Amino acid sequence: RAVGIDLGTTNSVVSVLEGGDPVVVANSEGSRTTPSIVAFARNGEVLVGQPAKNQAVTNVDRTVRSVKRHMGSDWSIEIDGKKYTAPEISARILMKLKRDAEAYLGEDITDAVITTPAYFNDAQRQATKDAGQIAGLNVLRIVNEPTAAALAYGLDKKEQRILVFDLGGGTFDVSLLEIGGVVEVRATSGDNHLGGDDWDQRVVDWLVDKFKGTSGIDLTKDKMAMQRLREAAEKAKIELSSSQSTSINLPYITVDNPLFLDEQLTRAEFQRITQDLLDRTRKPFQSVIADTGISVSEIDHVVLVGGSTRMPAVTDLVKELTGGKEPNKGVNPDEVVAVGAALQAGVLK
Missing domain, CATH: 3.30.420.40 (ATPase, nucleotide binding domain)
Known part of the structure; x- marks a missing residue:
């Protein structure tokens, strides 16, 4: 019955207690993290999460990313018929987290604690409660991200x-x-x-140069390839948290005749093209x-x-x-x- 929600700039997640024990629910796609992205198909169906992220690039104008950065504002987006205020948009991610956590428990939910970053202000915290309400959810209290974290490690001596x-x-x-x-x-x-998305970005760039260096082809202007590269760049970043090396292999990524992309990124190299991001x-x-x-x-x-x-x-x-x-x-x-x-x-x- 007791549920908590991390409404993140790029990813959101939902946890419920069982016994005095927190459990991290999996979304309808089988992931414990749900991208904070909301999008409107050229028809009127709302896509939220990974299905939104997948099409963000082919439907840029109807896709909203980082809506959290707008919360304490009068910001809005016009989708054919109506304006959606930032709380209205966040709500949609809450509605998806809601339908998803119900599925796992079988039962229903109506009340949650939601986290907020510590530097938020009243307008912002409020915009957050609003989206809570817009989503058929009764926001019980509302705590800030650092405090939440400490609570996960129960640091109350x-x-x-x-x-x-x-x-x-x-x-x-x-x-x-x-x-x-x-x-x-x-x-x-x-x-x-x-953010971490920047680390992945550097790898996408590195891949683009190395490739151009090989084929003389600029991939930036190819959406399919680019998407393929983002995926690969991410997994590469991941293998690098364990290995001292990783291979990117992308079969028949383009033509002229197909071309294979095959390149090895050393953790060291990775660290090098990312050093400014870390120092920041x-x-x-x-x-x-x-x-x-x-x-x-x-x-x-x-x-x-x-x-x-x-x-x-x-x-x-x-x-x-x-x-x-x-x-x-x-x-x-x-x-x-x-x-x-x-x-x-x-x-x-």
Whole structure:
């Protein structure tokens, strides 16, 4: 009955409690993550999630990505007949998460705790409750992403200073939480345009150059190929969190006669063409520290949010910034906020 929702810029996820235990529900496509993308076919059927993402490029004008960046605004999109305010759009992702979590439980849902980033304001938090209501959902309370995370690791002792390093698909947030058994967010920072999607982007570029170098063909102007490259670029990034190397092989990607794309990306190479993206993490981390006036040695815990924290380079970097402190592990780092959420929704229900 108690449910929590991570309404992310690029991906959303929904968790429900069973016993005093959080479970991360799988969407109707079999994934525990649902892209935060809403789209309107040239007919009037609404596609939400992966089916929206798949067609984003061939239907650009009717596809809305990162609607979360618009929430506390008067932003709107005109689809033939009507305007949809940001809350109306978010709602659609909530409706899909709703139909999907019902399926898994067999029963029905009407109430949830929803997370929000800590820097949100009242207009924004509110826009979030609205979308909640628009989706036949009664938003119980509403907590912020860092707090949610800490809750997933149940960090309610006595006192403590917690560092939350959150690297999502499209944003990077770093917060310093302080625990008395209450949780106040003391300092914040980030880079609103720093996400894992950028790491994947560099690999797509690398692939485009290497190929051009071989065939003299520019792929950017080919949608099918490009899509194929995004997929491949992503899996490559993934194999790199484990291997020191990965092969991209894309049979008959174009012609002139078909051409095969076959290339090997070394983790080292990967790290090299992504070094600026990673470094972009120092200053904000450092800021949060200075605001608080703390030596790194006084961080009691660090919890990593974001599937792209899985990357060795980030881990290594976090280690050095934190003075060698090991981050907590246990919860999928990109299920961590939704999990904290179902937990708070539990304290209530």
